[PDB]
Amino acid sequence: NVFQTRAGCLIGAEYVNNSYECDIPIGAGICASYQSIIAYTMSLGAENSVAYSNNSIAIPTNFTISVTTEI
């Protein structure tokens, strides 16, 4: 398994078309992870198209109380 990347050439992992969140940063948008060891292009996030129109409004009908920690 030999893969050529922008940061260098990586030996020991195979490139996978599937995209996951970054696990071990490599460089130039490529990350490696252990599922054997695989290399992939990191995914920024899940796409979400907002239903925009000039006469539609979305109003929340409920709420949730959230607690988060900052260190």
Binding site: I57, I59, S66, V67
Partner: protein
């Protein structure tokens, strides 16, 4: 009130469990401790370096060589150890400046999140900030940010203004929404439809200027009183 209290209690229990189970969340203070220990360990270990001299033991250098050359060797040892010590001090100064910046940020967070409610978005956690709670930790502080998060949204048809008797009525505090046949005025962050009256709307101008203005009646509370 009961639902909000239950949600708050469940959230606190969940936070306790999450800290109990996730080790990597509390990694910043551990990194501080590791950095200090590693720097001190490296400084100690540097003592066993020859620094270009023949021996790393100072008294061995005195004893095994003549003083004319032992002095040069000891000068090399002394300058090497001074270089090591000043490198340690410089790195400590830089790290101390970083920690001072972090502590200033922590004090600002305390003042603006714990001692009051902050309108700054994302400063006191994700969502609309309600209140915060401080907790002490080794070499640091932990904040418990309580936030309000909207949920279960619903589609509505909205209009900038309502045209009535040739007058344009704008929402005093809320927005105009319609469920398909009737129009109501509701507050922006929570769905509470209400009858559009003259008490929760204000009039400004005629209907030929506003774009998207729609036709609907506006109830007047006073009319039934003098009707009788």
């Amino acid at each position: 009130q009961k639902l909000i209290a239950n949600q708050f209690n469940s959230a606190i229990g969940k936070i306790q469990d999450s800290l109990s189970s996730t080790p990597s969340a509390l990694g910043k203070l551990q990194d501080v401790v590791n950095h200090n220990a590693q720097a001190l360990n490296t400084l100690v270990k540097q003592l066993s370096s020859k620094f270009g001299a023949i021996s790393s033991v100072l008294n061995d250098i005195f004893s095994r060589l003549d003083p004319p050359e032992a002095e040069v060797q000891i000068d090399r040892l002394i300058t090497g150890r001074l270089q090591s010590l000043q490198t340690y001090v410089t790195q400590q100064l830089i790290r101390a400046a970083e920690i001072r910046a972090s502590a200033n940020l922590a004090a600002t967070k305390m003042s603006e999140c714990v001692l009051g409610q902050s309108k700054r978005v994302d400063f006191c956690g994700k969502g609309y900030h309600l209140m915060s709670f401080p907790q002490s930790a080794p070499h640091g502080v932990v904040f418990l940010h309580v936030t309000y998060v909207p949920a279960q949204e619903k589609n509505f048809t909205t209009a900038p203004a309502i045209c009535h008797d040739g007058k344009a009525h704008f929402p005093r505090e809320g927005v105009f929404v319609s469920n398909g046949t009737h129009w109501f005025v509701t507050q922006r962050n929570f769905y509470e439809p209400q009858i559009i009256t003259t008490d929760n709307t204000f009039v400004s101008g005629n209907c030929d200027v506003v774009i998207g203005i729609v036709n609907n009646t506006v109830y007047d509370p006073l009319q039934p009183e003098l009707d009788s």
